[PDB]
Amino acid sequence: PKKVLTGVVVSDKMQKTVTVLVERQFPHPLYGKVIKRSKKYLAHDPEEKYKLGDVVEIIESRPISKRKRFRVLRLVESGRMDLVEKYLIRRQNYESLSK
Amino acid sequence: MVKIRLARFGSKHNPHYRIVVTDARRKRDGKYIEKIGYYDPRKTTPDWLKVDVERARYWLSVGAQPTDTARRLLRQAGVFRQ
Amino acid sequence: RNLSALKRHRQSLKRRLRNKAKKSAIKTLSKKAIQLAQEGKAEEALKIMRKAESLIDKAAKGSTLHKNAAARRKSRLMRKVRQLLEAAGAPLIGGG
Amino acid sequence: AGXPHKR
Amino acid sequence: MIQPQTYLEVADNTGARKIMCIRVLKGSNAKYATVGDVIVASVKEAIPRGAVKEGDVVKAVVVRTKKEIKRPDGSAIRFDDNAAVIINNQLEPRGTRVFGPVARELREKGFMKIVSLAPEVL
RNA sequence: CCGAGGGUAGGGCCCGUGACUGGGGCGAAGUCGUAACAAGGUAGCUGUACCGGAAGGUGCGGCUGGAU
RNA sequence: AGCGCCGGCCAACUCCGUGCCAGCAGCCGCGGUAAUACGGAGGGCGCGAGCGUUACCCGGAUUCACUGGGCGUAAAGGGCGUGUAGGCGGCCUGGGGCGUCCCAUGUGAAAGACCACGGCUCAACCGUGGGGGAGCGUGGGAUACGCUCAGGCUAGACGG
RNA sequence: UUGGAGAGUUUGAUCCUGGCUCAGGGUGAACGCUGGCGGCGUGCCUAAGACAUGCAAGUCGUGCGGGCCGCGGGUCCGUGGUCAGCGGCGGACGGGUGAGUAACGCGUGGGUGACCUACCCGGAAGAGGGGGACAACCCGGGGAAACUCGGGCUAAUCCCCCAUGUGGACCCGCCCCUUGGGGUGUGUCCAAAGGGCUUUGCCCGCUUCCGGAUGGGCCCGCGUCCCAUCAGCUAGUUGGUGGGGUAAUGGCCCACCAAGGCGACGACGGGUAGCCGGUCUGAGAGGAUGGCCGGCCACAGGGGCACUGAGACACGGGCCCCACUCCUACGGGAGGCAGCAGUUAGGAAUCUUCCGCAAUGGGCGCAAGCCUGACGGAGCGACGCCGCUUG
RNA sequence: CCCUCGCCAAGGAACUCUGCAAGUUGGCCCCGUAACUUCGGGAGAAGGGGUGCUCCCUGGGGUGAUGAGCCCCGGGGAGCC
Ligand SMILES: [Mg+2]
Ligand SMILES: [Mg+2]
Ligand SMILES: [Mg+2]
Ligand SMILES: [Mg+2]
Ligand SMILES: [Mg+2]
Ligand SMILES: [Mg+2]
Ligand SMILES: [Mg+2]
Ligand SMILES: [Mg+2]
Ligand SMILES: [Mg+2]
Ligand SMILES: [Mg+2]
Ligand SMILES: [Mg+2]
Ligand SMILES: [Mg+2]
Ligand SMILES: [Mg+2]
Ligand SMILES: [Mg+2]
Ligand SMILES: [Mg+2]
Ligand SMILES: [Mg+2]
Ligand SMILES: [Mg+2]
Ligand SMILES: [Mg+2]
Ligand SMILES: [Mg+2]
Ligand SMILES: [Mg+2]
Ligand SMILES: [Mg+2]
Ligand SMILES: [Mg+2]
Ligand SMILES: [Mg+2]
Ligand SMILES: [Mg+2]
Ligand SMILES: [Mg+2]
Ligand SMILES: [Mg+2]
Ligand SMILES: [Mg+2]
Ligand SMILES: [Mg+2]
Ligand SMILES: [Mg+2]
Ligand SMILES: [Mg+2]
Ligand SMILES: [Mg+2]
Ligand SMILES: [Mg+2]
Ligand SMILES: [Mg+2]
Ligand SMILES: [Mg+2]
Ligand SMILES: [Mg+2]
Ligand SMILES: [Mg+2]
Ligand SMILES: [Mg+2]
Ligand SMILES: [Mg+2]
Ligand SMILES: [Mg+2]
Ligand SMILES: [Mg+2]
Ligand SMILES: [Mg+2]
Ligand SMILES: [Mg+2]
Ligand SMILES: [Mg+2]
Ligand SMILES: [Mg+2]
Ligand SMILES: [Mg+2]
Ligand SMILES: [Mg+2]
Ligand SMILES: [Mg+2]
Ligand SMILES: [Mg+2]
Ligand SMILES: [Mg+2]
Ligand SMILES: [Mg+2]
Ligand SMILES: [Mg+2]
Ligand SMILES: [Mg+2]
Ligand SMILES: [Mg+2]
Ligand SMILES: [Mg+2]
Ligand SMILES: [Mg+2]
Ligand SMILES: [Mg+2]
Ligand SMILES: [Mg+2]
Ligand SMILES: [Mg+2]
Ligand SMILES: [Mg+2]
Ligand SMILES: [Mg+2]
Ligand SMILES: [Mg+2]
Ligand SMILES: [Mg+2]
Ligand SMILES: [Mg+2]
Ligand SMILES: [Mg+2]
Ligand SMILES: [Mg+2]
Ligand SMILES: [Mg+2]
Ligand SMILES: [Mg+2]
Ligand SMILES: [Mg+2]
Ligand SMILES: [Mg+2]
Ligand SMILES: [Mg+2]
Ligand SMILES: [Mg+2]
Ligand SMILES: [Mg+2]
Ligand SMILES: [Mg+2]
Ligand SMILES: [Mg+2]
Ligand SMILES: [Mg+2]
Ligand SMILES: [Mg+2]
Ligand SMILES: [Mg+2]
Ligand SMILES: [Mg+2]
Ligand SMILES: [Mg+2]
Ligand SMILES: [Mg+2]
Ligand SMILES: [Mg+2]
Ligand SMILES: [Mg+2]
Ligand SMILES: [Mg+2]
Ligand SMILES: [Mg+2]
Ligand SMILES: [Mg+2]
Ligand SMILES: [Mg+2]
Ligand SMILES: [Mg+2]
Ligand SMILES: [Mg+2]
Ligand SMILES: [Mg+2]
Ligand SMILES: [Mg+2]
Ligand SMILES: [Mg+2]
Ligand SMILES: [Mg+2]
Ligand SMILES: [Mg+2]
Ligand SMILES: [Mg+2]
Ligand SMILES: [Mg+2]
Ligand SMILES: [Mg+2]
Ligand SMILES: [Mg+2]
Ligand SMILES: [Mg+2]
Ligand SMILES: [Mg+2]
Ligand SMILES: [Mg+2]
Ligand SMILES: [Mg+2]
Ligand SMILES: [Mg+2]
Ligand SMILES: [Mg+2]
Ligand SMILES: [Mg+2]
Ligand SMILES: [Mg+2]
Ligand SMILES: [Mg+2]
Ligand SMILES: [Mg+2]
Ligand SMILES: [Mg+2]
Ligand SMILES: [Mg+2]
Ligand SMILES: [Mg+2]
Ligand SMILES: [Mg+2]
Ligand SMILES: [Mg+2]
Ligand SMILES: [Mg+2]
Ligand SMILES: [Mg+2]
Ligand SMILES: [Mg+2]
Ligand SMILES: [Mg+2]
Ligand SMILES: [Mg+2]
Ligand SMILES: [Mg+2]
Ligand SMILES: [Mg+2]
Ligand SMILES: [Mg+2]
Ligand SMILES: [Mg+2]
Ligand SMILES: [Mg+2]
Ligand SMILES: [Mg+2]
Ligand SMILES: [Mg+2]
Ligand SMILES: [Mg+2]
Ligand SMILES: [Mg+2]
Ligand SMILES: [Mg+2]
Ligand SMILES: [Mg+2]
Ligand SMILES: [Mg+2]
Ligand SMILES: [Mg+2]
Ligand SMILES: [Mg+2]
Ligand SMILES: [Mg+2]
Ligand SMILES: [Mg+2]
Ligand SMILES: [Mg+2]
Ligand SMILES: [Mg+2]
Ligand SMILES: [Mg+2]
Ligand SMILES: [Mg+2]
Ligand SMILES: [Mg+2]
Ligand SMILES: [Mg+2]
Ligand SMILES: [Mg+2]
Ligand SMILES: [Mg+2]
Ligand SMILES: [Mg+2]
Ligand SMILES: [Mg+2]
Ligand SMILES: [Mg+2]
Ligand SMILES: [Mg+2]
Ligand SMILES: [Mg+2]
Ligand SMILES: [Mg+2]
Ligand SMILES: [Mg+2]
Ligand SMILES: [Mg+2]
Ligand SMILES: [Mg+2]
Ligand SMILES: [Mg+2]
Ligand SMILES: [Mg+2]
Ligand SMILES: [Mg+2]
Ligand SMILES: [Mg+2]
Ligand SMILES: [Mg+2]
Ligand SMILES: [Mg+2]
Ligand SMILES: [Mg+2]
Ligand SMILES: [Mg+2]
Ligand SMILES: [Mg+2]
Ligand SMILES: [Mg+2]
Ligand SMILES: [Mg+2]
Ligand SMILES: [Mg+2]
Ligand SMILES: [Mg+2]
Ligand SMILES: [Mg+2]
Ligand SMILES: [Mg+2]
Ligand SMILES: [Mg+2]
Ligand SMILES: [Mg+2]
Ligand SMILES: [Mg+2]
Ligand SMILES: [Mg+2]
Ligand SMILES: [Mg+2]
Ligand SMILES: [Mg+2]
Ligand SMILES: [Mg+2]
Ligand SMILES: [Mg+2]
Ligand SMILES: [Mg+2]
Ligand SMILES: [Mg+2]
Ligand SMILES: [Mg+2]
Ligand SMILES: [Mg+2]
Ligand SMILES: [Mg+2]
């Protein structure tokens, strides 16, 4: 089955493309604790109907471009800009990490 | 073509073949597709030959080709009995 | 120091020229037809386009073109001719 | 490596 | 017409690239060296890990010149550079290859090895 | 058009090596003094600063891991 | 029939030679004129067409500690706040089912390993059969705990 | 529940902490002293340094025409060979190596409505008429050679046109489906090749199409070392449109437009490394390792390139550049052991220029058969394990 | 012969106290630019590419009117010697 993921939209700034931020949980193989890990997927939005804060599902599909390998499958939630802020604050904290 | 042949196992001076289906371009003792029986040419045990016969006919039906000395060990196991 | 590789090399050259000549014509008549399709020149375009199509599939008989290559090249040829003639007049003859 | 060089 | 201070390309694989003539080995006071004349040279540019290195004082034979050399038959020949081949005290080349054409004047002057290794003898 | 690579010019990283120079470690029986361990004969340690052949000394502040 | 070894660890001791020499040595250490520790000899211990040595890997090493360690003085608490990400988070009710748990099912090649039997006189080697997991795909189920969503509380916290 | 031992050494002595050290098992080993036999294994870990000589891929006369040669005669056929040529198929397998690669490379599970598959199998349909070229051969220069140029003849399963259209391909319609999947209608386009016998028929072959099977390509999730004393990286970069290209998706490639893409969940950079089944150790958890065997990847003196083709950007095929070596009659030409042996260099160190296609397997062939350094065996070496002797 | 000037084969500082003198370089546009630094600089570092003419398409400005004309700053494409 084509893999189906769920994540928010952290970028709408491309033509016919949105960035979907999927996260997953798993126990540490050695230290057992359940840890979080996230990953951005460049998803296909050909109708340009999806926007920031939208929690959506993406489906594995044939390549639209380089790097673009998933299609947005369906909306799930909307207006989750609270998650988008978490992403942006982190990327923002990187300026305080240089030298 | 897909074939049906003998993949010599055993040890030096101790031949022990597996009648097996594999690609003709695969190496002799290489990764086969399915095992359809074994064959001890030296006859050192009561049952030195054994063929599934049901499976040996499936691959035969779909286009597998036996070897010349593999065709015999399927004949001698009555794979061709009409 | 020898081989039948020498022979297989001689043959490769003969078929190289045989393949190149066919693809040259396939490119020539296709552009020729597409050029008329832009002018349209509707009848003359389609009359050429057939000779293109004929030579294309005539290549997929041997080792010059793969079937899906001929199909792909035919698909884009007729696809381009119609859209050019739609900026002009009736197709008149055939191939559509 | 012209032509003389600097190094 | 090579003289002290003249730079020359080395037409061999000795590792040298450019040598500067410091002497024309031709009698007491030869003003110039042409094709077939031996020179003494400093090695001004070499590639790493060669038979010769920068700063070596080597001997070489001029194998072609930008000054045209004249021939008894009324013809002349000229090259686009001054090239030489690094040799030893027995006039033998110190490398295994020579690059580019050389002037046939080398043959009559006693450099049979170089002439053979030459891709063209003009 | 692209193109192996060759060439010109200028950067970055790494390795080797260098007159000389800096301390470091180690080395049975060298020279100088005796700073520390006892209140070690000026309680010690301390951050800093300055000085002195050398340990060290002294100033300012801190600590007791200081005797009585 | 050879090779190592016989101070302790570590199984195997006496004589002579040597006198901080010559030498031994994996660690602790032996040798300065009575050395089971150096060298030879006799004897003794251990292996045996091998026996030792060097190099390297895991073990002992719970000495990178998930199983399974610590930080007053042994090495180890940041000079002290404030706070970003993150990690973690009180009592009750319900929705979902992500973690988590269960069942079924697909995959998990052969070889190898393991058990059984058998073939080379045994064995090594080799043949035949048996037993499977974890992980991931799918389908079904459970909802205590963790998660999320929704609603309520006042014991934490903040305020008057 | 088949599984867990510890000791020496800091002190006058003690407890603790803590490092060092030892007893165990392991090896593609090497070195010393020593050495009898057999079996099964196993053996360049360094210079992916350099290589003398033979060999490692050919086959089909049941596709074609010849030169030669013997066999039965009339220089006519047939015939046997034999040699190249044309034409098939194979040479993309198998064999070697571990340099590169920290990557969708590998592993594991998946996607392909985005795809291909020679020979094999199964079902459907068909093979009807014409024409043509190039080698071999004949003639002429050149060369030490490698060797090639020119002109002229000719056959075929070699090339081309026409016809036939079960079918298939393409554009545009509508239908079902739902990413390019399966239909259908008009127009348009595409097939073929013959040979051998025992001859109102078989056999090997040919042609278009559908399906199977097998082998592949491509894509995605998760996993996959060290350094943060590498903290910022990015212009085809990230997305879009159009187009090219391919079997096929894609910035894979080009034009243009947009300003995006990635990074402390470690981007970028540096170092090291082929990955896995497994192997070694360990009570396990873990650690270490990936030689031999099996799977995948990568490379073929160093690079770039395409051709032929079902399939290669091809180890023993081709082109070009570079480095090196070579023969030469000095005018000019050749080579690529990380195939099997073998040489040399390096190193502490690693084998026979052996036998055979009898077996298994592979290529070709109607078959006989031919080729097969794959393979099966023999050889050297206490390298290892096992068995045996010196009573 | 002197002055001022032009050119020169091969070499290219060998001249000489000294590259003295004379060559070289040279405007503009674009790319690009190191040590070090007092963070301004070093910098025109260095180094490189472009530069004419013709045709075609096109962006903005001043004037005027918002248009033509005139004037200013540009962009892309194809060519010619
Ligand atoms: Mg044997
Ligand atoms: Mg294969
Ligand atoms: Mg043309
Ligand atoms: Mg085709
Ligand atoms: Mg050179
Ligand atoms: Mg050098
Ligand atoms: Mg120098
Ligand atoms: Mg030379
Ligand atoms: Mg040259
Ligand atoms: Mg010559
Ligand atoms: Mg270029
Ligand atoms: Mg380039
Ligand atoms: Mg370059
Ligand atoms: Mg070049
Ligand atoms: Mg540099
Ligand atoms: Mg010093
Ligand atoms: Mg004294
Ligand atoms: Mg004192
Ligand atoms: Mg005092
Ligand atoms: Mg005092
Ligand atoms: Mg004092
Ligand atoms: Mg003080
Ligand atoms: Mg004082
Ligand atoms: Mg004080
Ligand atoms: Mg204080
Ligand atoms: Mg006090
Ligand atoms: Mg012992
Ligand atoms: Mg004792
Ligand atoms: Mg012991
Ligand atoms: Mg004892
Ligand atoms: Mg004495
Ligand atoms: Mg003595
Ligand atoms: Mg001792
Ligand atoms: Mg030891
Ligand atoms: Mg005595
Ligand atoms: Mg004594
Ligand atoms: Mg004593
Ligand atoms: Mg003793
Ligand atoms: Mg001892
Ligand atoms: Mg003794
Ligand atoms: Mg033994
Ligand atoms: Mg040993
Ligand atoms: Mg143990
Ligand atoms: Mg451990
Ligand atoms: Mg250890
Ligand atoms: Mg440690
Ligand atoms: Mg430690
Ligand atoms: Mg713990
Ligand atoms: Mg501890
Ligand atoms: Mg504190
Ligand atoms: Mg601080
Ligand atoms: Mg927080
Ligand atoms: Mg939480
Ligand atoms: Mg809770
Ligand atoms: Mg769940
Ligand atoms: Mg298995
Ligand atoms: Mg069992
Ligand atoms: Mg298991
Ligand atoms: Mg599962
Ligand atoms: Mg489910
Ligand atoms: Mg123990
Ligand atoms: Mg102890
Ligand atoms: Mg001690
Ligand atoms: Mg102490
Ligand atoms: Mg003591
Ligand atoms: Mg005490
Ligand atoms: Mg005492
Ligand atoms: Mg103790
Ligand atoms: Mg300890
Ligand atoms: Mg201890
Ligand atoms: Mg050991
Ligand atoms: Mg030995
Ligand atoms: Mg063996
Ligand atoms: Mg053996
Ligand atoms: Mg070697
Ligand atoms: Mg190894
Ligand atoms: Mg190697
Ligand atoms: Mg070397
Ligand atoms: Mg060499
Ligand atoms: Mg042979
Ligand atoms: Mg034919
Ligand atoms: Mg022939
Ligand atoms: Mg292979
Ligand atoms: Mg092998
Ligand atoms: Mg080998
Ligand atoms: Mg191998
Ligand atoms: Mg590798
Ligand atoms: Mg890297
Ligand atoms: Mg990295
Ligand atoms: Mg990956
Ligand atoms: Mg994968
Ligand atoms: Mg996979
Ligand atoms: Mg083929
Ligand atoms: Mg066939
Ligand atoms: Mg004909
Ligand atoms: Mg004809
Ligand atoms: Mg001809
Ligand atoms: Mg010639
Ligand atoms: Mg001739
Ligand atoms: Mg001709
Ligand atoms: Mg219809
Ligand atoms: Mg037709
Ligand atoms: Mg026909
Ligand atoms: Mg992929
Ligand atoms: Mg990954
Ligand atoms: Mg597109
Ligand atoms: Mg790209
Ligand atoms: Mg572009
Ligand atoms: Mg742009
Ligand atoms: Mg991440
Ligand atoms: Mg590297
Ligand atoms: Mg390595
Ligand atoms: Mg590597
Ligand atoms: Mg352990
Ligand atoms: Mg075990
Ligand atoms: Mg590993
Ligand atoms: Mg391997
Ligand atoms: Mg081997
Ligand atoms: Mg392997
Ligand atoms: Mg390469
Ligand atoms: Mg090599
Ligand atoms: Mg090459
Ligand atoms: Mg290469
Ligand atoms: Mg082709
Ligand atoms: Mg390749
Ligand atoms: Mg090949
Ligand atoms: Mg190639
Ligand atoms: Mg080769
Ligand atoms: Mg050539
Ligand atoms: Mg000649
Ligand atoms: Mg030549
Ligand atoms: Mg020539
Ligand atoms: Mg030539
Ligand atoms: Mg060549
Ligand atoms: Mg070649
Ligand atoms: Mg070899
Ligand atoms: Mg060898
Ligand atoms: Mg050697
Ligand atoms: Mg050596
Ligand atoms: Mg061997
Ligand atoms: Mg055979
Ligand atoms: Mg086989
Ligand atoms: Mg066979
Ligand atoms: Mg056959
Ligand atoms: Mg042969
Ligand atoms: Mg042989
Ligand atoms: Mg063998
Ligand atoms: Mg050996
Ligand atoms: Mg043995
Ligand atoms: Mg003039
Ligand atoms: Mg001049
Ligand atoms: Mg000049
Ligand atoms: Mg100069
Ligand atoms: Mg110059
Ligand atoms: Mg000067
Ligand atoms: Mg003068
Ligand atoms: Mg002078
Ligand atoms: Mg001077
Ligand atoms: Mg002056
Ligand atoms: Mg001046
Ligand atoms: Mg000037
Ligand atoms: Mg000027
Ligand atoms: Mg000037
Ligand atoms: Mg600089
Ligand atoms: Mg400077
Ligand atoms: Mg600055
Ligand atoms: Mg600046
Ligand atoms: Mg300066
Ligand atoms: Mg400036
Ligand atoms: Mg400039
Ligand atoms: Mg500037
Ligand atoms: Mg310029
Ligand atoms: Mg003009
Ligand atoms: Mg304008
Ligand atoms: Mg205007
Ligand atoms: Mg005005
Ligand atoms: Mg106005
Ligand atoms: Mg105006």
Q: Which residues of D touch E44 (CB under 8 A)?
A: 4
State the method: X-ray
Are E51 and E34 in contact by the 8 Å Cβ rule? The answer is: no
Are E119 and E95 in contact by the 8 Å Cβ rule? The answer is: no
- Domain with residue C23: its CATH number is 1.20.58.110
- Domain with residue A82: its CATH number is 2.40.50.140
* Total domains in the fold of chain C: 1
* HSE-CB for C86 with a 13 A CA cutoff: 7
Domain that holds residue B23: 1-82
**C51 CB-near residues (< 8 Å, 6+ apart):** C29
**D1 CB-near residues (< 8 Å, 6+ apart):** E17, E45
Q: Which residues of E touch D5 (CB under 8 A)?
A: 45
D1 near E CB under 8 A: yes
Residue A85 beta carbon within 7 A of nucleic strand H: no
Are A11 and A18 in contact by the 8 Å Cβ rule? The answer is: yes
Q: What is each CA distance from E76 to E61, E71, E73, E105, in whole angstroms?
A: 20, 6, 9, 12
Strand ranges for chain B from DSSP E: 2-6, 9-11, 14-23, 34-39, 65-66
Give the nucleotide at minimum CA-to-C1' distance from A33.
G66
CA atoms of B77 and B49, how far apart (whole Å):
8
Which residue has tokens 């080709």?
B65
Are C74 and C53 in contact by the 8 Å Cβ rule? The answer is: yes
Q: Which of B66, B4, B77, B60 is nearest to B34 (CA)?
A: B4
Residue E35 beta carbon within 7 A of nucleic strand I: no
Q: What is each CA distance from A90 to A55, B31, C36, in whole angstroms?
A: 19, 50, 60
- Which residues are placed with Cβ below 5 angstroms of ligand 124, an ion? C 63
- Domain with residue B76: its CATH number is 3.30.1320.10
**Do the Cβ atoms of E17 and D1 come within 8 Å?**
yes
Domain that holds residue C39: 1-96
CA E62 to chain centre: 3
Q: Which of C67, C84, C68 is nearest to C31 (CA)?
A: C84
* Total domains in the fold of chain A: 1
* Total domains in the fold of chain B: 1
**A57 CB-near residues (< 8 Å, 6+ apart):** A4, A5, A6, A72, A73, A74, A76
Domain that holds residue A32: 1-99
Q: Which of E17, E63, E11, E12 is nearest to E38 (CA)?
A: E63
Covered bases, chain I (protein CB within 7 Å) = 9-14
